[PDB]
Amino acid sequence: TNIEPVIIETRLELIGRYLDHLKKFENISLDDYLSSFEQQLITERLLQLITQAAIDINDHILSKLKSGKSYTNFEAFIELGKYQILTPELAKQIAPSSGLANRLVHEYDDIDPNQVFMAISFALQQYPLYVRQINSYLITLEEENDLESGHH
Amino acid sequence: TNIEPVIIETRLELIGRYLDHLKKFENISLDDYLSSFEQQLITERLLQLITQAAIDINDHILSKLKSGKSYTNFEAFIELGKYQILTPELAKQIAPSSGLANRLVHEYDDIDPNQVFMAISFALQQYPLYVRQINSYLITLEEENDLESG
Incomplete structure (x- = not known):
């Protein structure tokens, strides 16, 4: 209805690409990770962008479903869980x-x-x-x- | 004045670490850079952290030297140059x-x-x-x- 799907779909695509690269670290050992500032930098940026992309999606959704209402980034996730957009769990x-x-x-x-x-x-x-x-x-x-x- | 040197010294140490790692990319070729998402992620975060550390230093200095006044990140650099903390150049x-x-x-x-x-x-x-x-x-x-x- 009011939400604009392209803003969301673009960010979902980026999160998918970020996760694809983050998955390359799924089996790295603790010792190897802690020894490599370069690998820390890669994973830190990926985690930062995944979470920021999700924050931007959430803000956009709530800006259309709960116009004029203010949410912290934590509260925004819980609100999506309240309205069946995410599962509460x-x-x-x-x-x-x-x-x-x-x-x-x-x-x-x-x-x-x-x-x-x-x-x-x-x-x-x-x-x-x-x-x-x-x-x-x-x-x-x-x-x-x-x-x-009818069909769009 | 009321400046807390620990705030500035810790950020200068961090900038030094980031610059030492950024130096590893000083002579890479653009074509290789464009092909490597991992090189882009590394350099993006280093540049982000260097600039944010400097912004944080600048905000602390000006919060004591020019308390009450507000500056944008761009203006904070210029103001430090105006007071010869940095060179204007x-x-x-x-x-x-x-x-x-x-x-x-x-x-x-x-x-x-x-x-x-x-x-x-x-x-x-x-x-x-x-x-x-x-x-x-x-x-x-x-x-x-x-x-x-003394």
Whole structure:
């Protein structure tokens, strides 16, 4: 209806490409990761852009569904889970990771690579589910719109 | 004055680490760069962190030297040059790179690697001078602090 699918689809595509490259680190050992600033830089940027892309999708959706309402990045995930856009279970699991987009940008003097190593596996598990659920939401909206007004 | 040297020293140390790694990309060819997403990710984050660290230093300095006044990231560089904390020549050269910290974070769907490639060379030429000039400024603060005490 009011949401613009191209803004969302573009970001879902980028998240897919970011995840494809992040998956190359799925089996890296702790020792190898902690020894390589270069691999930390790659994964930190990928995690930052995945989470920021998801934040931008969420803000756009809520700007059309809950116009004039303000949400923190954490609250935005939970609200999508309340309205069946994400499952409440995924929303609650993935909402903490929303702080990564901020800490990797502004708390660069305080990045513990042991913690980022864990965030890699959490993102590879959670954000493919996020992409599929947002994508399913788009399909449902389009179907409901087609049913309401005939084929588009 | 009310400046906390630890804030500036920690960011200068981080900029030094980032520049040492960015230096590994000083002589790469553009065609290879365009073909490597991993090279683009590494250099993008290094440029983002260098510029954000400098912005943070500049914001701290000006929050004490010009409290109450607000500056954009571009204007913060120029103001430091105006007060000879940086040279006006370096401040003018380096101020446009200050937008990198925002574009690499929020305009991730609109990054031209050809422009980032150019930004590598600019940052390798300009931010070593920035680090030296800020370090000279810290020394003047320590000298002043030595006078006020002993």
